[model samples]
Target: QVQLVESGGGLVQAGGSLRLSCTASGRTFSDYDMAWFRQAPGKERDRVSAISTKGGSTWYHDSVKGRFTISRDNAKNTVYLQMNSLKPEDTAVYYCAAGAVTYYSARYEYDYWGQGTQVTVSS
Candidate 1:
């Protein structure tokens, strides 16, 4: 009943950046955090970051910080994961996910997925 939709062009220049937003409907955004993943065809999905709506905090995978970052727009209850300094390696399907929060720990896993947005890096 919940969904996240991503939007962006399929072709990206080598040095360009891509911006895609994930909007949630049919559920309360206040109840969960938003996560993003990067997956190239035939490869495993890479966890990018999780944005906590309650605290406005962000967590990132140090190995991926150079090319990725996650952000959220609390007023709109929407989240965004963007990549910059594009390279062929950046080409992949980026997804916006929504998940339920665990106990008081604040940890969550992706439960709902978006209609993945494909971005290609090539000049």
Candidate 2:
């Protein structure tokens, strides 16, 4: 019954920076890793990065290159994604995803996803 809810929105200038938050409820955040994903309006979701609640270490997917960062405020069960060097290509829906038990793989995908926060990069 875990769930992620997101908040934050703004028009970011190209090469600027942006930030958002994903707050989770109904479970202990330490029980699973929390991550973020990016999705262009019509494209599939791609993993950005994941962070362990026990530690702040993270692993980011190569596709993200280096524009995204995943961090969390454990006291509130909230995870955050802050991106730098904004660009038109960065415009998309960013989601907070929680990794939990999959049917078989030790690696877990997002069993729960946030409603998502929409961001736009402009001139």
lDDT of 2 by residue, 21-92 (tens): 988888877777887778987899877778886655788877555887788887888888888888798888
7-114: candidate 1 lDDT, tens digit per residue: 565788898887778777766676777788778989988667777767378888775676777887767768877778888877788878877446556555577887
The local distance difference test score of each candidate is: 0.75, 0.80
Model 1 per-residue lDDT at 95: 79
Q: Candidate 1 — which residues are off by over 4 angstroms?
A: 100-108
- The numbered model that scores best in TM-score is 2
The TM-score of candidate 2 is: 0.83
What lDDT is reached at residue 23 by model 1? 75
Q: Which residues of candidate 2, in runs, are more than 4 Å off? A: 63-66, 102-108
